Subunit: 124 residues, 2 copies
């Protein structure tokens, strides 16, 4: 149905090499854009918009996203989910939780890859 | 497929004549116990546990749910979702948001229906 391929950090980016863990029979269409894969969230950085550690994050595999959206970003194979805010060569990955702080990423100091766009949560 | 039968208030119990509004292709087996139907959440009373306004709440239909669990209950024909705590003929419906107050129900005073157990969330 829809494949689970690993985790993503809702806090300090954790490293991870994704591979199919399981399959959830869920109409990928329920999400807009359609959901391509799932990631087990780990952390409470995004708890204010309802994303909880342990939740499955539905993601649409894309490479272009606009500010204010919420994406799954990888840095040195360390993945994290947060609200984007690119400006010049600097990229801010903002959280949804007061106890946490943003995470600036310099495009000319390190490699930055957008893994996808957050299009919905699943919690069972 | 999973049937959406209407709204549920994550706050003050709201009036709702449940009726099959749609079907979501989502294995009922993904939740434990199996989900029998969905509800549209309305309000922020259960925000502290990730249940946000607009969220689809999975529900297993049963009358017998125990203290501490999140239930879907009906009072004066209006439905709500909250944490359960029943002692004798006094039932408390607790929220998950400091901004809201708990609801008290005296079983000698009125009819009290437990629609089902909340067992999941889908956000799309």
């Amino acid at each position: 149905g829809l494949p689970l391929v690993g985790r993503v950090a809702a806090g300090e980016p954790l490293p991870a090499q994704w591979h199919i863990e399981g399959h959830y029979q869920v109409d990928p269409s329920l999400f807009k854009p359609n959901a391509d894969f799932l990631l087990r969230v780990s952390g409470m950085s995004m708890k204010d918009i309802g994303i909880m550690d342990g939740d499955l994050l539905a993601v649409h595999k894309t490479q272009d996203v606009r500010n204010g959206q919420v994406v799954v970003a990888r840095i040195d194979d360390a993945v994290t989910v947060a609200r984007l805010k690119k400006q010049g060569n600097k990229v801010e990955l903002l959280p949804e939780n007061s106890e946490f702080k943003p995470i600036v990423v310099d495009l000319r100091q390190q490699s930055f890859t957008i893994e996808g766009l957050a299009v919905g949560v699943i919690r069972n």
